[PDB]
């Protein structure tokens, strides 16, 4: 049986994130633009888009 190690997502606030090429098996990275995540007290990010 496998184990899917999923770390905390890197939310790049007010910037554009860049994928770093690692030699992990089935390594998967995807940068989604225009995300505006909400926490208990509102937006985690100061910038709007």
């Amino acid at each position: 049986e496998y184990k899917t190690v999923i770390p905390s997502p890197y939310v790049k606030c007010c910037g554009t994130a860049e994928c770093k090429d690692k030699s992990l098996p089935d390594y998967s990275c995807k940068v989604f633009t225009g995300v505006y995540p909400f926490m208990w007290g509102g937006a985690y990010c100061f910038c709007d888009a």
Binding site: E1, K3, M39, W40
Partner: protein
């Protein structure tokens, strides 16, 4: 021997159904299960820190 949890702190996670339909940013929110046992026992990873005072 259990003196390993010194500087720890629990969570408030994103429970998808907190009862009554909708979602809750809840402290009891379960994040991951694992059912590798061959006789139905379940190993659960919850966002609490039990036993600690």
């Amino acid at each position: 021997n259990f003196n390993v949890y010194k500087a720890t702190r629990p969570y408030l996670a994103h429970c998808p159904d907190c009862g009554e339909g909708h979602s809750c940013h809840s402290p009891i929110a379960l994040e991951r299960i694992r059912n590798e046992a061959t006789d139905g026992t379940l190993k659960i990873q919850v966002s609490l820190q039990i036993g600690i005072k």
